[PDB]
């Protein structure tokens, strides 16, 4: 059996009161992405900011937002592709003449939702870090393009989406948008790869996705001094994060139904 | 209360004693369950049985009980020495409610007295500054249960000032009561002698003091 | 009532022994994704049969409530009959009998055969 | 199981109101239901009613069925089969008859024909329906004295003379010494207030290593008081020993 | 009576916790998505058209989504998906140039 | 006592008749070798439910000893009871039946059908 913690108000661990069995899980759909995670389920009540060890600077904290906050993304070149024979069968498929102008991928956020969104964390922020305390937002320390941005397929194509803007922010105790650049590139190598990587074909024409961010991989800094103004960073790295994100609400048992016990019974000659 | 229980009962140690638990049809017996509390006075209860027959977890085999089609009783046997207190039943069925009934009282017996262990402690100095002058005559470990605290003036009682109250069960299944009496502080130097007597049935004891200090 | 697989999870273990074929009924029937499937069809049947190889080393290939003629050693419980079946739940109850439940077994299966060679001297007299 | 512990005393005015509370753990409170027995005197023995955790279902008495409300809180859980729970009894109108004993106690069986039979019960909550206001209990302590000058024994503890109402802490040294735990119940003056002492055995031989204080209370007005024994004797037969 | 028999019980409402491997399920609308495209959504079994998640009343169970396989599971699952996928798809090795 | 699994291999056959629970208990539960694996855990349950099918199309789904209808042909073994229970091992045993088990097992497939069809009969009339 499957167990399902139907429990609104849920951290991911501990005793859950109200439980389901089931077979399968929900729809988990694969979106293996850095920085924020996105069109994935959303909290029914409030936003649920789950770690494992919160105390513990070295251990991330994953957001699970209650409102979707929709960022809508893309590349504007009318790009173009030629396909090469290798030969015979082997064929290379070539980034073509681009037609138009050529300008730079971004994505774009309600800054009126995100502000929204970002005072919610904070409200349930302070329910872990006291009740006067300043909790501000900066951008990635330093790392792999991987982690030090945010990283999506949109299209078909690799986005790599500069978060400088998101986390940049300070939050004390008591009409456009946020155009966010990107790159993109197309000899990929995720999941940590060593010996093989991955020519990603030139996608023909103009791209464009739209989509829902459901949650955020952040990370504290671990400076501290019982200072009152522990800030918090988008983190990423380890992808078991995205699905941790989505599992919370299972568990896999073994079902033994070999029950014995005494009852006043005995067997006939 | 509607439900009868029995005044009082006796027993020997190692013996055995029962109890009545009768009532009209419109409470006890037929068509109806019945359970058993052993309920010290001042201290929480201990449930024994229920329906009737079934003891609960926890209880000795010498516990047992049994309905008649009239009245309800309980037997205790193996009696020993700390079962010597406070007993009350209850009439219920699934839906309804308790039904507790008048009380009943055990008094074993076959066990052997005790000698009392007096220690008077007169009052302090800081007392007297109130003013108000008293004393405290303290009696511990006796049985049976039961004493008298008398006092004197000049070859005759005491005819104010009295408060006596009664003995209590204690951890070692032995008995202790209290008794003070308020003199007024003109009575110090200018009276001679005055007795704290309490009575008990195997010997006598008194805590006799003069004020002159 | 229809509570549902396993809906007796909090229930008595007395109204639980009442919806027991509901839980044996959902336990059998119900190239990369290929494999996953196999060695889950196997291991469904695999789990299975090792309940049924119990039940019929001992006589309860019946089944469900089976009584036998190994008497309950007080050791292993020795709570009385109300408080396990109008009380407690058999993920509870599960627990405690957990510590001697193999070897409960064991006394069960030398129980069985000994009723066989005993029922063929019966049949064989008469 | 679980223990069951309760709200302390408290005095309330006649035409008034009053709400008790019991906290549950070791148990799953919803599990079993939840009692309400009183000891006043007239009556002796009485039960109020009970509650279902779990359905919320009330079954009171007619003599508590205008006057009383039944409360349940919300169970917050230890582990699986442990839980953490509260429950309440708001008795609406305050009559002489009331001043007495009540207790909580959980339900025996989860089914059965005796599932909601009282098995464990808390410790004791009190209530002294009264006219008369509140008295703080005026502490004095006790000239040590001893019971057998051949045996080598002494003894000593506390005294309060006067307060209303009851009941009274006992302790020593923050709940240290564990040894001649004794007591005395109160008596009542003729004007109605209460009385009562305190001891416990000691040898002689030790005065300074020993170290006194009763750290005693009296909470239905919020009062605290700490005091220390003596050594100035008044029996002869103490001084002997030494 | 007093004596009490051990009777055997088939079909007790008891788990343990385990770990095992589980298998996938999707909808027809994946397979109608054709184009030879979507990975191991052919292999795939399907999703049920009713499905059933029966609640258990009266009963709590210890979570921990830190400490959990169907996850470890399921990543693997999704990197060894994804790298059967480029076996057939062509090798640039002389593109490294 | 307890000898082991096949521990009366050379025990006579009443002897080995007594340790039966013990055989039938060890044989269930107890990417090179991945294949290994699996193709010996089918095997397994295929070789073992090969064995309840025909223990079911007989009558004899208890099981352990089960007596039946079929008569013992004195052309398969026609030795005396004392020389095959009290001195006779089944490895010699099985030797000599073997010509014709076979067949023996068919005069006990038709003869359980043939119960059934009757035993309708008298639940009919009664
Ligand atoms: C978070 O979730 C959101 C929401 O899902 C995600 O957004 C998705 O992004 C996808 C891209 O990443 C995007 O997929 C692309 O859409 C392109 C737009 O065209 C499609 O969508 C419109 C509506 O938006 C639809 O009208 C089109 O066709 C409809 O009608 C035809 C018949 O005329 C149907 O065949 C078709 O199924 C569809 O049916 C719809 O209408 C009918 C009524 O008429 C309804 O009854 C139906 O229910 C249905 O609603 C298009 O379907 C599209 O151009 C892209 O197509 C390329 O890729 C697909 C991959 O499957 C491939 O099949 C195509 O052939 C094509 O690739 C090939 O062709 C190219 C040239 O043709 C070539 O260059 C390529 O190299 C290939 O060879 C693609 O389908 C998707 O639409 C949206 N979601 C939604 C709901 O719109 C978001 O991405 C998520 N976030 C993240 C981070 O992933
Ligand atoms: C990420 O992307 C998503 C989408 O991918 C963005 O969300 C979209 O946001 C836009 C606005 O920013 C939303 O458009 C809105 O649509 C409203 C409804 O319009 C429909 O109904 C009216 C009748 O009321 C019809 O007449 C319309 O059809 C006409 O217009 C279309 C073109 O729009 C023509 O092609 C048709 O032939 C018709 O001529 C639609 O069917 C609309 O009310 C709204 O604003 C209009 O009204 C205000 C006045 O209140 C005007 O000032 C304004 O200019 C708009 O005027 C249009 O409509 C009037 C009639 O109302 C016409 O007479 C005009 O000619 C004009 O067309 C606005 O247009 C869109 O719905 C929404 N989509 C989704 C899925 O959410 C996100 O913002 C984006 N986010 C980020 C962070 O980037
Ligand atoms: C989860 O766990 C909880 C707790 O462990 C568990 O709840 C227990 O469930 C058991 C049943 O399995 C309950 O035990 C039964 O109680 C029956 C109660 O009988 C009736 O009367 C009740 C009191 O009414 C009095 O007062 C009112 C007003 O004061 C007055 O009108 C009445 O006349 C009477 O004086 C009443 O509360 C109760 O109400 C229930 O049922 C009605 C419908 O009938 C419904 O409307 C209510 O909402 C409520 O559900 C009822 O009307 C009792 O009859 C029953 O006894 C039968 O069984 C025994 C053997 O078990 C037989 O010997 C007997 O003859 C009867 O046939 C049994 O005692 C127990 O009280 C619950 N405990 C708690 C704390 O809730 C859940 O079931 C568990 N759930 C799961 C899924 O596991
Ligand atoms: C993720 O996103 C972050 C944030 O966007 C990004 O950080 C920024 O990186 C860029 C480099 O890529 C930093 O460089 C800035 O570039 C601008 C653009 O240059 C134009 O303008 C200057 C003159 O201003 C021209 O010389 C030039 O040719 C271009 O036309 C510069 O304007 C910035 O310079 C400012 O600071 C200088 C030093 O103080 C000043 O001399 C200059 O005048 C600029 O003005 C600032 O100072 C003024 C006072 O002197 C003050 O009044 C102004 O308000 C202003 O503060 C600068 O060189 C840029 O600084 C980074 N942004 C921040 C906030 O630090 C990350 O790089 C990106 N991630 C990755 C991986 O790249
Ligand atoms: C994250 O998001 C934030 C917005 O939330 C965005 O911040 C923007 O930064 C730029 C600078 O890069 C701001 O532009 C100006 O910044 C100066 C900084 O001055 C400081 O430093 C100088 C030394 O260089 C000191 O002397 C000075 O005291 C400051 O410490 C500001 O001074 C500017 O504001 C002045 O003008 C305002 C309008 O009149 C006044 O209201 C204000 O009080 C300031 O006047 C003060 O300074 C004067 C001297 O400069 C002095 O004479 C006055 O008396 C007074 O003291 C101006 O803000 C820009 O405004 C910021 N945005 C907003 C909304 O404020 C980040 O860029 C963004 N980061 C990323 C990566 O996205
Ligand atoms: C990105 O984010 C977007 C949103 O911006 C996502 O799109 C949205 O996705 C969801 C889920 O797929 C869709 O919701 C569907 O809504 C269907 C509604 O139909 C049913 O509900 C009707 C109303 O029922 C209310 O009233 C009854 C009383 O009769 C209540 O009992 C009931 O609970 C409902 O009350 C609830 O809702 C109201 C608001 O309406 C609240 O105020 C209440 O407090 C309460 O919460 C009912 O009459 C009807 O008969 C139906 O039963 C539903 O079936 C379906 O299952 C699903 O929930 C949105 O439609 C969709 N919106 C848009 C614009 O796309 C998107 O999925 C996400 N991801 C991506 C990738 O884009
Ligand atoms: C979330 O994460 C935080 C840490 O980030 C945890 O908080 C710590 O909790 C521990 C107790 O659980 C606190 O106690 C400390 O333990 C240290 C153990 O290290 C010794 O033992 C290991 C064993 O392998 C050795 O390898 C190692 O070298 C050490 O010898 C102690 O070292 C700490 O100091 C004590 O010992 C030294 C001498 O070694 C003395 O000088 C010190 O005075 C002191 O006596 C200490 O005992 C620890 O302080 C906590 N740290 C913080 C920052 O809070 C949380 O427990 C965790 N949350 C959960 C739920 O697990
Ligand atoms: C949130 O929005 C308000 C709207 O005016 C804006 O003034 C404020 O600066 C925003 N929050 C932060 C932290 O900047
Ligand atoms: C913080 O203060 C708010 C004030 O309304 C209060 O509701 C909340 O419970 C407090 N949280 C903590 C963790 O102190
Ligand atoms: C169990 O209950 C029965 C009910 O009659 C009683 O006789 C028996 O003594 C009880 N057993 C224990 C151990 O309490
Ligand atoms: C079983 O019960 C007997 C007495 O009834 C006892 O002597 C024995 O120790 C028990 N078994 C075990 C394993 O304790
Ligand atoms: C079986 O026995 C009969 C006589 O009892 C004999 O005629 C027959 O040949 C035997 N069967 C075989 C196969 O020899």
């Known amino acids: 059996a499957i167990l399902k913690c139907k429990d609104k108000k849920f951290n991911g661990t501990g005793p859950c009161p109200s439980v389901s069995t089931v077979q399968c899980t929900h729809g988990i759909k694969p979106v293996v992405s850095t920085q924020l995670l996105l069109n994935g389920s959303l909290a029914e009540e409030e936003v649920m900011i789950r770690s494992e060890n919160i105390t513990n600077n070295a251990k991330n904290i994953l957001v699970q937002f209650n409102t979707p906050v929709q960022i809508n993304c893309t590349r504007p070149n009318n790009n173009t592709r030629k396909s090469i024979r290798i030969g015979p069968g082997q064929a290379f498929y070539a980034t073509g003449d681009i037609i138009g102008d050529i300008r730079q991928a971004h994505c774009n956020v309600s800054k009126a939702t995100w502000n929204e969104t970002l005072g919610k964390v904070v409200k349930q922020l302070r329910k872990h870090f006291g009740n006067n305390t300043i909790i501000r937002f900066a951008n990635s320390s330093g790392g792999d393009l991987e982690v030090t941005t945010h990283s999506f397929n949109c299209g078909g194509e690799f986005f790599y989406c500069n978060t400088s803007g998101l986390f940049n922010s300070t939050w004390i105790s008591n009409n456009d948008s946020i155009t966010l650049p990107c790159r993109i590139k197309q000899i990929i190598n995720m999941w940590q790869r060593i010996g093989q990587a991955m020519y990603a074909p030139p996608i023909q024409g103009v791209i464009r996705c739209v989509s829902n961010i459901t949650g955020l991989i952040l990370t504290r800094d671990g400076g501290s001094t019982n200072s009152t103004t522990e800030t918090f960073r988008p983190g990423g790295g380890d992808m078991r994060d995205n699905w941790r994100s989505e599992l919370y609400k299972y568990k896999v048992v073994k079902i033994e139904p070999l029950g014995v016990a005494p009852t006043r019974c005995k067997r006939r000659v | 209360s509607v439900l009868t229980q029995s005044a009082s009962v006796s027993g020997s140690l190692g013996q055995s004693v029962t109890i009545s638990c009768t009532g009209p049809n419109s409470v006890c017996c037929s068509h109806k369950s019945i359970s058993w509390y052993q309920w010290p006075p001042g201290r929480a209860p201990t449930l024994i049985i229920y329906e009737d027959n079934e003891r609960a977890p926890g209880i000795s085999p010498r516990f047992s009980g049994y309905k008649s089609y009239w009245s309800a009783y309980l037997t205790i046997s193996d009696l020993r020495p700390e079962d010597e207190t406070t007993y009350y039943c209850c009439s219920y069925t699934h839906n309804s409610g308790c039904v507790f009934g008048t009380g009943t009282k055990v008094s074993v017996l076959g066990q052997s007295k005790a000698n009392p262990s007096v220690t008077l402690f007169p009052p302090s100095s800081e007392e007297l500054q109130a003013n108000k002058a008293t004393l405290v005559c303290l009696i511990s470990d006796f049985y049976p249960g039961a004493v008298t605290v008398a006092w004197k003036a000049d070859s005759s009682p005491v005819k104010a000032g009295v408060e006596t109250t009664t003995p209590s069960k204690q951890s070692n299944n032995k008995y202790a009561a209290s008794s003070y009496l308020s003199l007024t502080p003109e009575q110090w130097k200018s009276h001679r002698s005055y007795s704290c007597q309490v009575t008990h049935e195997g010997s006598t004891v008194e805590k006799t003091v003069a004020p002159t200090e | 009532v229809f509570l549902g697989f396993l809906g007796a999870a909090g229930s008595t273990m007395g109204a639980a022994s009442m919806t027991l074929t509901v839980q044996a009924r959902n336990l059998l029937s119900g190239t990369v994704w290929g494999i996953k499937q196999l060695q889950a069809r196997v291991l469904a049947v695999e789990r299975y049969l090792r309940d049924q190889q119990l039940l019929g080393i001992w006589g309860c290939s019946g089944k469900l409530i089976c009584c036998t003629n190994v008497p309950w050693n007080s050791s292993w419980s020795n709570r009385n009959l109300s408080e396990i079946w109008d009380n407690m739940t058999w993920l509870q109850w599960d627990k405690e009998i957990s510590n001697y439940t193999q070897i409960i077994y064991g006394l069960l299966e030398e129980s069985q055969n000994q009723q066989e060679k005993n029922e063929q001297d019966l049949l064989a007299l008469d | 199981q679980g223990q069951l512990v309760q709200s302390g005393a408290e005095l309330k005015k006649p035409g008034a109101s009053v709400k008790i509370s019991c906290k549950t753990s070791?148990?799953?409170?919803?599990?079993?239901?939840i009692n309400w027995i009183r000891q006043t005197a007239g009556r002796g023995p009485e039960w109020m009613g009970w509650?279902?955790?779990?359905?919320?279902?009330?079954?009171?008495?007619?003599?508590?069925?205008?006057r009383v409300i039944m409360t349940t809180d919300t169970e917050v859980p230890v582990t699986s089969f442990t839980s953490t729970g509260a429950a309440y009894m708001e008795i609406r109108n305050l009559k002489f008859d009331d001043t007495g004993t009540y207790f909580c106690?959980?339900?025996?069986?989860?089914?059965?024909?005796?599932?909601?039979?009282?098995?464990?019960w808390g410790q004791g909550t009190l209530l002294t329906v009264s006219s008369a206001s509140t008295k703080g209990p005026s502490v004095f302590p006790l000239a040590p004295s001893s019971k057998s000058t051949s045996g080598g024994t002494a003894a000593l503890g506390c005294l309060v003379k006067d307060y209303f109402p009851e009941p009274v802490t006992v302790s020593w040294n923050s709940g240290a010494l564990t040894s001649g735990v004794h007591t005395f119940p109160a008596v009542l003056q003729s004007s109605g207030l209460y009385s009562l002492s305190s001891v416990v055995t000691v040898p002689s031989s030790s005065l300074g290593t020993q170290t006194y204080i009763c750290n005693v209370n009296h909470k239905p007005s919020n009062t605290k008081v700490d005091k220390r024994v003596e050594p100035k004797s008044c029996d002869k037969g103490l001084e002997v020993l030494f | 009576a007093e004596n009490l028999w051990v009777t055997v019980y088939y079909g007790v409402p008891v788990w343990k916790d385990a770990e095992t491997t589980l298998f996938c399920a999707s909808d027809a609308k994946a397979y109608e998505t054709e184009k030879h495209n979507v990975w191991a959504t052919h292999a795939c079994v399907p999703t049920d058209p009713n499905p059933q998640e029966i609640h258990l009343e009266n009963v709590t169970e210890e979570f921990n989504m830190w400490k959990n396989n169907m996850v470890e599971q399921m990543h693997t699952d999704i990197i060894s998906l994804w790298d059967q996928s480029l076996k057939p798809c062509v090798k640039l090795t002389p593109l490294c140039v | 006592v307890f000898l082991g699994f096949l521990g009366a291999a050379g025990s006579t056959m009443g002897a080995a008749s007594m340790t039966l629970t013990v055989q039938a208990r060890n044989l269930l539960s107890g990417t090179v070798w991945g294949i290994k694996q699996l193709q010996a855990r089918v095997l397994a349950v295929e070789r073992y439910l090969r064995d309840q099918q025909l223990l079911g199309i007989w009558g004899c789904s208890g099981k352990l000893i089960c007596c039946t209808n079929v008569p013992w042909n004195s052309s398969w073994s026609n030795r005396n009871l004392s020389e095959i229970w009290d001195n006779m091992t089944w490895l010699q045993w099985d030797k000599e039946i073997s010509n014709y088990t076979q067949i023996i097992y068919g005069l006990l497939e038709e003869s359980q059908n043939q119960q059934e069809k009757n035993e309708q009969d008298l639940l009919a009339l009664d």
């Open positions: 106690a959980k339900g025996l069986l989860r089914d059965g024909s005796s599932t909601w039979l009282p098995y464990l």
């Open positions: 070791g148990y799953r409170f919803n599990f079993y239901h």
């Open positions: 509650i279902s955790p779990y359905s919320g279902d009330k079954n009171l008495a007619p003599a508590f069925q205008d």
